[PDB]
Amino acid sequence: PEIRLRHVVSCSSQDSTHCAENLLKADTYRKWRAAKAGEKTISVVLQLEKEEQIHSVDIGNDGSAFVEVLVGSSAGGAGEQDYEVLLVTSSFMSPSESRSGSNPNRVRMFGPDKLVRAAAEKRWDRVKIVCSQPYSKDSPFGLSFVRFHSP
């Protein structure tokens, strides 16, 4: 959502799925996330070496109220506005739940049907996952996992 709330990483010899799994359990990320405690929203950006087409997306929450997935194409450049929505901002916790810490770990699968078609049809080498949690700013909220499925 803005550079200081965005953790950018290179996914060199790994696809988006592997890059994410490694990012999320990475000490550097956990320390970065710690440094951003108290923040209403954070994102991670996966810089893919090879552009990929994303069939569907599985998301495992870790205390986020909303999650959104956007995609971008680095060639030519890519500012914030040039990102295209892949998975529209989606609910994982209510404000009540956010405050009570109840059901922080919902999993939702989003098949081709639930993604933005125009975007899911294209290929991308930037994947931005945005986690919003305005109701529990102080928790180290994010995702347990995010998986991208490709042909």
Partner 1 sequence: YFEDFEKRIPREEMLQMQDIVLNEVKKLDPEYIATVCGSFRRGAESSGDMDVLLTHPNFTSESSKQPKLLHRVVEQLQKVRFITDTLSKGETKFMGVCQLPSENDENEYPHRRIDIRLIPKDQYYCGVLYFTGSDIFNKNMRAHALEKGFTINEYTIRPLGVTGVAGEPLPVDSEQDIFDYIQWRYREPKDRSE
Residue 83 within binding range of partner 1, rule CB under 8 A: yes
The token pair that represents 37 in the structure block: 């405690």
Interaction residues for partner 1, span 33-72 (CB under 8 A): 43, 66, 68, 70
Sign of the Cα torsion 55, 61, 62, 66 reads positive
Residue 89 within binding range of partner 1, rule CB under 8 A: yes
Paired residues of 74 in beta bridges = none
Contact (CB, 8 A) for 42 and 7? yes
Contact (CB, 8 A) for 92 and 67? yes
Interaction residues for Na ion, span 13-32 (CB under 5 A): none
Residue 76 within binding range of Na ion, rule CB under 5 A: yes
Among 31, 55, 80, 112, binds partner 1 (CB under 8 A): 80
Q: What is the DSSP letter of 122?
A: S
Give the residues lining the site for partner 1 (CB under 8 A). 1, 43, 66, 68, 70, 80-81, 83-85, 88-91, 94-96, 128, 130, 132, 134-135
